[PDB]
């Protein structure tokens, strides 16, 4: 599948439902589709062809969501660039990624590198609305991860498996706060999961989301919010009551201590707390651990169990599966794998290796250590290095 295909079901089912809320701007599902179609038409009219990469340099806004969807409708993959990156980093990402065109706003126009076509999203053009259509094997985005940043090339099929996963449990009444950089793959949960579920994406006001802005967002109707491990830890120790009123808070990335989760649960008994784990190479997250309302976290916070449609293996130095309670190398397989690393076939072939448990399939070597619990959860045991 593809996220546009999943998105199309929600546009058909409830076209007048709210899809994106920006400060004074509210876009319904039908309105979002029409805007993306017009910008896609512009891209097709400029010579954009299937598989092309289009860079994106925008601040979070309704225009951002439209741009990513428009690139997909034109058959191309978006290369997200954070407007706050230094110019040499921006220049490197554009050049390494093979993007020949770059969508920007008036405010970001000066960040487009020289020699790269700038496409100003608020400019009109004559081209009719037209869409080539996303396809599951075509590329969906290239996200850079670091010494030097490398581009992880992710196909539509992997993005849709993540975004459409039933485990997210996002429903039409949900409202998800969007504040993560769209250059990072936490934005795939904040943008695409609600849109494939019928919910609304709520663009956070400019600046970092602090506890106060979180409380205010909750008062305005936000029901789910992802925070980086650092942000979750800060708010949990200083103002854990700020999560009150959320249906679910999510966190992951860097290490999260069990103590932080226990503090939140004590202040907010009804809040679901979800720990996410995974690399960009496996689309946002491959495993997760969910603390239900009223439940108390143990002394250790697991990275949890594989998402539906995924598999994990813990292998020793001989590539043999270990028994529970044995620390080994963590490998991720099943749904959500990237195609590989752009321009780096050797790196792809050493990180994305043959999977002995699935014929012809690959697994991603996380470089992390883990052990199984007796009942099939995973505990982090540090990086192999």
């Amino acid at each position: 599948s593809t996220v546009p295909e999943l998105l199309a079901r929600q546009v058909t089912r409830a076209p007048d439902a709210v899809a994106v809320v920006d400060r004074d701007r509210v876009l319904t599902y039908r309105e979002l589709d029409e805007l993306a179609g017009r910008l896609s038409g512009r891209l097709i009219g400029r010579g954009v062809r299937r598989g092309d990469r289009v860079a994106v340099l925008l601040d979070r806004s309704a225009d951002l969501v439209v741009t990513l969807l428009a690139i997909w409708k034109a058959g191309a993959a978006y290369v997200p660039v954070d407007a706050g990156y230094p110019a040499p980093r921006v220049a490197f990402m554009v050049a390494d990624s093979g993007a020949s065109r770059m969508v920007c706003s008036a405010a970001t126009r000066d960040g487009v590198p020289e020699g790269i076509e700038a496409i100003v999203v608020t400019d009109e053009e004559a081209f009719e609305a037209s869409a080539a259509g996303a396809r599951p094997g075509d590329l969906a985005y290239v996200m850079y991860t670091s010494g030097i940043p490398k581009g992880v090339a992710v196909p539509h099929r992997s993005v849709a498996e993540l975004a459409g996963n039933p485990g997210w449990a996002v429903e039409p009444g949900d409202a998800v706060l969007m504040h993560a950089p769209y250059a990072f793959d936490a934005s795939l949960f904040e943008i695409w999961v609600p849109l494939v579920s019928g919910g609304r994406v709520v663009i956070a006001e400019p600046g970092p989301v602090d506890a106060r802005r979180l409380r205010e967002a909750i008062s305005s109707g936000v029901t789910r919010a992802y925070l980086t491990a650092g942000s979750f830890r800060a708010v949990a120790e200083e103002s854990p009551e700020s999560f009150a009123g959320l249906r679910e808070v999510l966190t992951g990335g860097d290490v999260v201590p069990a103590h932080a989760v226990a503090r939140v649960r004590s202040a907010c008994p009804r809040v679901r707390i979800r720990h996410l784990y995974g690399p960009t190479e496996t689309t946002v997250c491959a495993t997760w651990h969910l603390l239900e309302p009223g439940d108390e976290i143990g002394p250790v916070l697991p990275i949890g169990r594989p998402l539906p449609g995924r598999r994990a293996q813990v292998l020793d130095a001989s590539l043999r599966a270990v028994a529970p309670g044995v620390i080994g190398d963590l490998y991720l397989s099943g749904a959500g794998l990237a195609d590989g690393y752009l321009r780096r076939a050797g790196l792809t072939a050493e990180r994305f290796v043959a999977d002995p448990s699935a014929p012809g399939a690959r697994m991603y070597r996380t470089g992390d250590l883990a052990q199984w619990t007796a009942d099939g959860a995973l505990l982090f045991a540090g990086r192999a290095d």
Binding site: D339, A349, R362, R365
Partner: protein, 64 residues
């Protein structure tokens, strides 16, 4: 030491039906659906074969 990172290890290059290449430690049985096409050789030698011979990451199914 993880076997896939050992620069002094002996390695194979494998290929699946989609044309994707994989490094593989030569001591381990080759999984089903994968064919050995190079090695045993040094890690760098195997990486060089891949860089030389894997010219399109795109799955061979995608191309046709």
């Amino acid at each position: 030491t993880n076997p896939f990172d050992n620069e002094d290890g002996s390695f194979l290059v494998l290929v699946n039906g989609e044309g994707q290449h994989s490094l593989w430690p030569a001591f381990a049985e080759v999984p089903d659906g994968w064919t050995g096409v190079h090695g045993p050789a040094s890690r760098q030698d195997c990486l060089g074969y891949v860089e030389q011979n894997w010219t399109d990451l795109r799955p061979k199914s995608l191309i046709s």
